[PDB]
Amino acid sequence: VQPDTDETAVQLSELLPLPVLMKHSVTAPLAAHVSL
Amino acid sequence: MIHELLLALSGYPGSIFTWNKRGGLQVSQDFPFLHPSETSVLNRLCRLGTDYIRFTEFIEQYTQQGQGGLHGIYLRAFCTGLDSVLQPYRQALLDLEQEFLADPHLSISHINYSLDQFQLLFPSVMVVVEQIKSQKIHGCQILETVYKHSCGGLPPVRSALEKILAVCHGVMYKQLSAWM
Amino acid sequence: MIHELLLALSGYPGSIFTWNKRGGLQVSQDFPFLHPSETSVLNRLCRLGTDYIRFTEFIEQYTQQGQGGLHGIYLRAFCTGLDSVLQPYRQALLDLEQEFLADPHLSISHINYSLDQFQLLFPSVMVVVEQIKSQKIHGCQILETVYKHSCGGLPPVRSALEKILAVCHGVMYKQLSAWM
Amino acid sequence: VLTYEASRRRCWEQIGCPPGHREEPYLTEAGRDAFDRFCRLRQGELQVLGGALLQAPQPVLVKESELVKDTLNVLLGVVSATFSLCQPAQAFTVKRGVHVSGASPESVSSLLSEVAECGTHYARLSDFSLQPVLDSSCSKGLVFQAFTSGLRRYLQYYRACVLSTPPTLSLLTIGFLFKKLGRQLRYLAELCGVGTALPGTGGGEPRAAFPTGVRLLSYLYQEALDNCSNEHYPVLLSLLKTSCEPYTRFI
Amino acid sequence: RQYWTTRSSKFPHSLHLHSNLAAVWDQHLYSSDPLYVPDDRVSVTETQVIRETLWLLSGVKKLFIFQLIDGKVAVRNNIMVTHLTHSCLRSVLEQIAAYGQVVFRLQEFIDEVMGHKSTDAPFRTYQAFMWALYKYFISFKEELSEIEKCIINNDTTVTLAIVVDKLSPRLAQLKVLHKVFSTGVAEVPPDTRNVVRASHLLNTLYKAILEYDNVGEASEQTVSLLFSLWVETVRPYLQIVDEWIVHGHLCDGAREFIIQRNKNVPVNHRDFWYATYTLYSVQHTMVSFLKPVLKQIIMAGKSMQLLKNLQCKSLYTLFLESVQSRLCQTFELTLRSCLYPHIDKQYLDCCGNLM
Amino acid sequence: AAAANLNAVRETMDVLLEISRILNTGLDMETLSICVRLCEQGINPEALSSVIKELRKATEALKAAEN
């Protein structure tokens, strides 16, 4: 379920590209969790 | 009357003014009120009409530079800036259509005079954009055409380039944010 | 046959009326529908018409700095003042035109009765202007020929001279104010 | 019986009692009813030169009210009369050449056809937005589920925006109001391809389909990383940030 | 059967010679001379002619009758009007066509100026003139639009004398600025390089400000239009001064400046004060309004370039404020007042700060 | 044609209004046409004028009595 033209996540993964912030936060935490 | 004209402004080729930008706003010589006033008005409108047809085609191509052309995601931002400039132009077209609806006796000549500001600013911005893109200056090399074009005397073109340069400054800030 | 006779007196000669340069506002006398003496009154008006033509020529020639003729702000001011006086004449002409166009039967005799006032104020100014041109006065010289005529006797002419002399002495006042 | 007024039109060519009647003034300076006859005559002359080759393109006499109503129809992404999801259309298919207010059908229905491309993309896109719910027996995992559930809810929000306006807006104004929305739809549907009656594109490029399974997640993530900060690129970026929560559950 | 159509207007009005002026004149011709075969001048409605004239005032490319020939406004002498005679109609046509040809050439010039570097710049004087012409032609077209609204009333009309009176400041400024533009442009020859053309145009603009200074004391409309155009033209030069006084240089090096920008002198060179800060010919294309200021101008430009090197309301805005405060008399009043207070303060402060 | 009649009636009414304003008669616009046109049926102008004068005197008396 996605919202209306809610610019928050749109810009979060757009101004800083989607995989950019994704690797900064999730994939980095993903690697940390896998190592742990 | 002005219905087909605004349709061509909106991308819908008028039957007379066939707005296929390759052939331009090709005005068929079936002119109602077929005096040189009417024909001249058709040509004056067709100037901005073909300009906007080409502009819309370019914005669709910029819906974009990272390909084999001048590489860079900034072409989509340039399309966004041009569309932001046209947003005043789109609002002008909408207001003109509203006025045409209000005026039974349509003020076609006055409408052309009123929209002449945008029509005149269109050639300069189009020339600047052609310098940026047809030169295929990759990255902000195409940005240089307008950035060092700061000695641009045309206040209308100056404002359009100012919108484009706000977009460029934001894009450069984002690029610097990445590189930092 | 009224509207064109007015156009011919408006500084744009007609066809039954021939504005001969040296023959003044002459009239090709071949048309029907009036008496020649009606044409004679029209010729009395054509005196003022030719005067207006010559006055316009002079005003445009004295409204262009390297010529040997009289120059300075004085000549341009004289042309401007004569034009501003003709503004009452132009306004009266326009009002009379509207009245004649409004009336189904508005006699040219009525047009004459309306234009008698301007014809009354006209000739004295024409004589004064011809004298000023013959004097070729410059500097405050014309400003004193004016002061000589500013004791005039024609009430409309006297008032017009007062206004023009006010404009002139205002110019002199400005010059002296710079000198002060 | 003396309350009458008169015409101020006074002519120097009419030397008597001038009424003032013009000369059938310039259709450029006045149309919307007479320009209709003129443009229809021009279209008919072109048709007579070409052998009456319009049939449907012969003006579908469309009241501006009727056009606005059909626009409100496609505002739900529905298949209006000029937006019918015909067999070889899957989506907006034009009516019999709607004319404009004081025009023939060529430019009128041309702008209508641009708006019809928009509404056809809307119909197909709404079908694509139903991909999570529709693919209940989906062998692709929570990828299609979260993504197209997001599509359905975002289309619900978009429908809230669309229905928030009166159905009597100017066709050009509405199209401009959805131009960014149109770009978002084109970019998303080029990755969707949701034609139903005539399959294929559901908006955007000739979108045959969308990528498969969580490979659709992979392609979508790469695309959202590259195509960012646009009508669909920011919309897809927000959708990916949301599906990160589906990724949190997948963790 | 109009100029819109391909036929002369053949319609009647209220009868007799009161409205039959061409028909009355033609009767005089045919009856006086039975062989007076009337030149079949296409009858035209006076009000239709008025509508066409409104289009031409707005800038119509031509008319079936009022076809602009040879660039200038011209008329097909094969047209007539029952409410007027050929000669009178011709006189009215010529009265319109004076400004018609002037504005034809003027619109051609404006369009050519519109056309419709990196450390260098464009000849910003040309673009400033284009913008000023844009504003002026905008005023003219707005007047034409008001006339068109009056026509669209279709129940009220105005004598062409009335239209001319509305165009009184319009036509006056038209002639005056036609002469002024002749001066500025033709004096800046095609041979005149960007520097030469700008210097000649600026000298002619100052001279024209001093000339229309006394073309009438009420020319403040036309005079104010010329003053605004001169302010715009200075805006190229004023912007150049601001750039060469803030950063000492900029991305603008137009070579439109009458100053000899011998840029071969490096930043780390003593000769950069002379070569780059030299006076350019086509001692140079110097005007005493700036030539008397030229010594301090070279000092301040060298100072700003050196201050930028040492680090390694603008002049236009303050000048605009002064010009608004200022705007018969000439450009000397406002120009001298700004040059003394504004230019003197700028020069002294720039020299001191750079030092 | 009827528009011409209406325009002519308006023009005659305006001429009559000007004539009345110049005469300073004090007659109202209500006697625009009704007063003249009714006499136009061939009324005795002296008798009609006397009747109008009597009406004016009675109206003045009525206004004074009301006041």
Q: What is the 3-state secondary structure (H, E, C) of C130-146?
A: HHHHHHCCCCHHHHHHH
Contact of E86 with E25, CB cutoff 8 Å:
yes
CB-CB neighbors (< 8 A) of E149 in chain B: 107, 110
Using DSSP bridges, classify how beta strands E79-80 and E42-43 pair: parallel, antiparallel or unpaired: parallel
Give the Cα separation of E266 and E272 in Å (integer).
6
CB-CB neighbors (< 8 A) of C1 in chain E: 17-18, 21, 24
Across the interface, do D108 and B12 touch by the CB < 8 Å criterion? yes
Task: Give B174→chain A minimum CA distance, Å.
Answer: 7
Across the interface, do C101 and D12 touch by the CB < 8 Å criterion? yes
Size of interface A-D (CB pairs under 8 A): 92
Neighbour-count burial for E130-146, b at 16+ CB within 10 Å, e otherwise: bbbbbebbeebbebbbe
Contact of E146 with E59, CB cutoff 8 Å:
no
Using the Cα atoms of residue B33, residue B36, residue B37 and residue B42 in order, give the sign of their dihedral.
Answer: positive
Reported resolution, Å: 6.8
CB-CB neighbors (< 8 A) of C104 in chain D: 16-17
| CB nearest to D9's CB, from E15, E16, E155 | E155
Across the interface, do C1 and E17 touch by the CB < 8 Å criterion? yes
CB-CB neighbors (< 8 A) of E92 in chain C: 7, 12
DSSP D79-132: --STT---TTTSS----S-B--TTS-HHHHHHHHHHHHHHHHHHHHHHHHHTHH
What tokens does A13 get? 């993964």
Residue whose tokens read 């405060």: E325
Closest CA to D11 of A35, E51, B172, E19: E19
Residue in D closest to A31 by C-alpha: D251
Contact of C160 with C121, CB cutoff 8 Å:
yes
Residue whose tokens read 């646009």: D230
Task: Give D21→chain F minimum CA distance, Å.
Answer: 13
Which residues are within 8 A (CB) of E327 and not within 5 positions of it... i.e. 6 or more apart?
Answer: E224, E227, E228, E334
What's the Rg (C-alpha) of chain B? 18
| CB nearest to E85's CB, from C15, C32, C33 | C15
Across the interface, do B177 and A20 touch by the CB < 8 Å criterion? no
Give the Cα separation of E212 and E331 in Å (integer).
9
Neighbours of chain E (3+ CB pairs under 8 A): B, C, D
Instruction: Kindly give the residue spans of alpha helices, DSSP state H, lying in chain B.
Output: 2-9, 36-61, 74-102, 108-134, 141-147, 155-179
C2-5 LR contacts (CB < 8 Å, sep 24+) = C2/C100, C2/C106, C2/C108, C2/C111, C2/E18, C3/C97, C3/C100, C3/C101, C3/D12, C3/E21, C3/E83, C3/E84, C4/E21, C4/E84, C4/E85, C4/E88, C5/C42, C5/C108
Across the interface, do A20 and B178 touch by the CB < 8 Å criterion? yes
3-state secondary structure of A33: helix
Give the Cα separation of E214 and E66 in Å (integer).
35
Question: Is D13 in CB contact (< 8 Å) with chain C?
Answer: no
Closest CA to D187 of D205, D174, D175: D205
Contact of D32 with D102, CB cutoff 8 Å:
yes
Chain-centroid distance of CA D179 in Å reads: 9
**One-letter amino acid for residue C107 of the chain:** S
Contact yes or no, F with A (3+ CB pairs under 8 Å) = no
Interface test with D, best of C101, C103, C105, C106 (most D CBs within 10 A): C101
Task: Give A9→chain D minimum CA distance, Å.
Answer: 4
Question: Is B107 in CB contact (< 8 Å) with chain E?
Answer: yes
Task: Give B83→chain D minimum CA distance, Å.
Answer: 10
CB-CB neighbors (< 8 A) of D16 in chain C: 104
CB-CB neighbors (< 8 A) of B79 in chain D: none
Give the Cα separation of B124 and D229 in Å (integer).
27
DSSP E54-84: HHHHHT-S--SSS---TTS----TTEE-TTS
CB-CB neighbors (< 8 A) of B105 in chain E: 152, 154
Which residues are within 8 A (CB) of E27 and not within 5 positions of it... i.e. 6 or more apart?
Answer: E17, E20
Across the interface, do F3 and D19 touch by the CB < 8 Å criterion? yes
Task: Give D41→chain F minimum CA distance, Å.
Answer: 34
Contact of D207 with D127, CB cutoff 8 Å:
no
Question: Is D6 in CB contact (< 8 Å) with chain E?
Answer: no
Residue in D closest to E46 by C-alpha: D13
Task: Give A31→chain B minimum CA distance, Å.
Answer: 22
Task: Give D48→chain B minimum CA distance, Å.
Answer: 14
Give the Cα separation of E323 and E235 in Å (integer).
12
Q: Among residues 18-77 of chain B, which lie with CB inside 8 Å of chain A?
A: none
Question: Is C178 in CB contact (< 8 Å) with chain D?
Answer: no
Instruction: Kindly give the residue spans of alpha helices, DSSP state H, lying in chain E.
Output: 16-19, 21-32, 46-58, 86-114, 124-153, 160-166, 168-181, 187, 194-211, 220-246, 291-311, 315-326, 332-337, 344-354
Give the Cα separation of B37 and B43 in Å (integer).
10
Closest CA to E330 of E201, E209, E207: E209
Question: Is B174 in CB contact (< 8 Å) with chain A?
Answer: yes
CB-CB neighbors (< 8 A) of A21 in chain D: 241
Across the interface, do D26 and E4 touch by the CB < 8 Å criterion? yes
Residue C32: DSSP 8-state: -
